Ligand binder design. Sequence first.
Ligand SMILES: CC(=O)N[C@H]1[C@H](O[C@@H]2[C@@H](OC[C@H]3O[C@@H](O)[C@@H](O)[C@@H](O)[C@@H]3O)O[C@H](CS)[C@@H](O)[C@@H]2O)O[C@H](CO)[C@@H](O)[C@@H]1O
Length: 485
Amino acid sequence: SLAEIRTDFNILYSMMKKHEEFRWMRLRIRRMADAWIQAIKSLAEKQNLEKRKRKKVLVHLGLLTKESGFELVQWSDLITSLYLLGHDIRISASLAELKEIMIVELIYIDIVGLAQFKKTLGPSWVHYQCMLRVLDSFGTEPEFNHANYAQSKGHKTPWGKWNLNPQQFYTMFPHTPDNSFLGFVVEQHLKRQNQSLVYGKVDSFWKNKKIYLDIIHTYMEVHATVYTKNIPSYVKNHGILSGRDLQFLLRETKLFVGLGFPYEGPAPLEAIANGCAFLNPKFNPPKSSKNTDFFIGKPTLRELTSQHPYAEVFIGRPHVWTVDLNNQEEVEDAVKAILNQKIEPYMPYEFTCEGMLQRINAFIEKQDFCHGQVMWPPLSALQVKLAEPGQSCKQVCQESQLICEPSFFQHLNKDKDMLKYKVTCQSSELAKDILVPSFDPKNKHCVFQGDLLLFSCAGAHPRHQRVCPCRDFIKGQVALCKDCL
Ligand SMILES: CC(=O)N[C@H]1[C@H](O[C@@H]2[C@@H](OC[C@H]3O[C@@H](O)[C@@H](O)[C@@H](O)[C@@H]3O)O[C@H](CS)[C@@H](O)[C@@H]2O)O[C@H](CO)[C@@H](O)[C@@H]1O
């Protein structure tokens, strides 16, 4: 009944072949087989992976059911990680298989599949909800997760209102510390020219970018991989390329040119992994559900400061140049600096096979939401910081090379507890608000949280200071504190 790491993928191929939609993921795993097997072996050498309980795991892809009416790289890398860790995976892609499978101990599912889960099981779905790990690309902030609080704000979300522990939501990039960062692996299939490659397979992505692209064209060739109105005539199109052929072109390319869309994708990381610089359009104002139709109705008010905020903040220069495209002299300076500077290929640790294996194994072994409030990460990692007015708990932790840990909020929510962190409450009141525990420096006063489901890393107090729980993290592995293994 103990998990045994796997080093042969034959059983995984037979599992994935039962679903036609995984055809190209089976091809991707076969390419990445050696990288996966070397990573699981390396993880078993660096950490004690013995005596782990074998878990029966449901993986329900709601987006693949025909009832949804409706991405897959994350699912495959999650399934592969579970498989290599030795767990018992039951893949579901319809209401029928979901009914049959529903002895289960972990449920990976998307929000669309979650509504199918609630309907298939009826009221006893809440009996299982602490086992849910909800793949939610753009993240869910507590303001939208708390159904009654969402109504009080007027939030119209088809995606929120689920009243889960917000750490049960698993995001595509570490942009929402209220959630868990699941991510994926950037596949690496493997002389550089004065040429750029535009990020964008759709011609409509190129509208209005002529002035922008003309600046780059002054210094480099402009290449593309497009399916042609908005494409300048000087663009050297390559057509659609296999992933392997795309990476050879990336090794030939100095600059990967972002157009502003799509947001938060894997392609910039794959460019950087092959020695490309990424020109990352900066957004003023930042784009969110409040001002961008692409984000309308998302269960979050997160603001994207650029096309790829992860690349902007967690990678940065010299690999990522975040520039407002209207600042033509700044764009000229960036393209020119990238022209002579030699950058070496860079891949963040958390987006490698071993990084994800370590991350997902820690989540499986340490994340427990079935006994009320949480005890992992350990309290030892708690580093308290006070955010300034207009600053969120996410920001005050990030600026100090830490990250907000929502499970620590419970330890900063009363008078006596605040003494340990050098904040003296002459007087205290309680509020049900995502912005508390708030501190009042100009006047003694503390406001504590009256609804524990409203603990929120996101959100900035407009007048007061926020008491913010931060934690360290293993370098290149934002999801794990140093003592979290
Ligand atoms: C795969 C993925 O990223 N899913 C996230 C989802 O992303 C949106 C989703 O929209 C699908 C479908 O949704 C219906 O409600 C209608 O609005 C349809 O018009 C729409 O096509 O998937 C597409 C990619 S196919 C993506 O572009 C959408 O943004 O968003 C939710 C909420 O943030 C997230 O939880 C899912 O993980």
